[PDB]
Design a protein around this ligand. Structure first.
Ligand SMILES: COc1cccc2onc(N)c12
Ligand SMILES: NC(=O)c1ccccc1
Length: 134
């Protein structure tokens, strides 16, 4: 077993709050905000050795990242930013920091009851996205 065990599986989006405002703060343009905001992604998390893979699949886009904790990687986000990302585990929370163009945003993923709660923060704006097992 490893502690990241509790994240592994297939998850479906069940609620979202403030995501349009988060996207505005990140710099996402109108059309992508509307279509991305409509999406109901599944999140598929797996682990093989030290490598964690997170896939996010929707009618809008299918994305995939694989990474080792603490080891930076380059990521093309669903909104087409080219970012430098680092993901760590802090007290049981996956903490994903994206850097680009002198800006930064942080996405936290945590298990709470039977949910996987995703908190996205850009400056003072937070969006909370709740997933449940598929
Ligand atoms: C991280 O992936 C997403 C985050 C937010 C909305 C999304 O729509 N399609 C996606 N793959 C997606
Ligand atoms: N999984 C999500 O819904 C998500 C939203 C925004 C940024 C990263 C992930």
């Amino acid at each position: 077993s490893h502690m990241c065990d509790a994240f592994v599986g297939t998850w479906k989006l069940v609620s979202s709050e403030n995501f349009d405002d988060y996207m505005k703060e990140v710099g996402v343009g109108f059309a992508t905000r509307k279509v991305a905001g409509m999406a109901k992604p599944n999140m598929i998390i797996s682990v093989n050795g030290d490598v964690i893979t997170i896939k996010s699949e929707s009618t809008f886009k299918n994305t995939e990242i694989s990474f080792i904790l603490g080891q930076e990687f380059d990521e093309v986000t669903a909104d087409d930013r080219k970012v430098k990302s680092t993901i760590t585990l802090d007290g049981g929370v996956l903490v994903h920091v994206q850097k680009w163009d002198g800006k930064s945003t942080t996405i936290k993923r945590k298990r709470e009851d039977d949910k996987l709660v995703v908190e996205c923060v850009m400056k003072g704006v937070t969006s909370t996205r709740v997933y449940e097992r598929a």
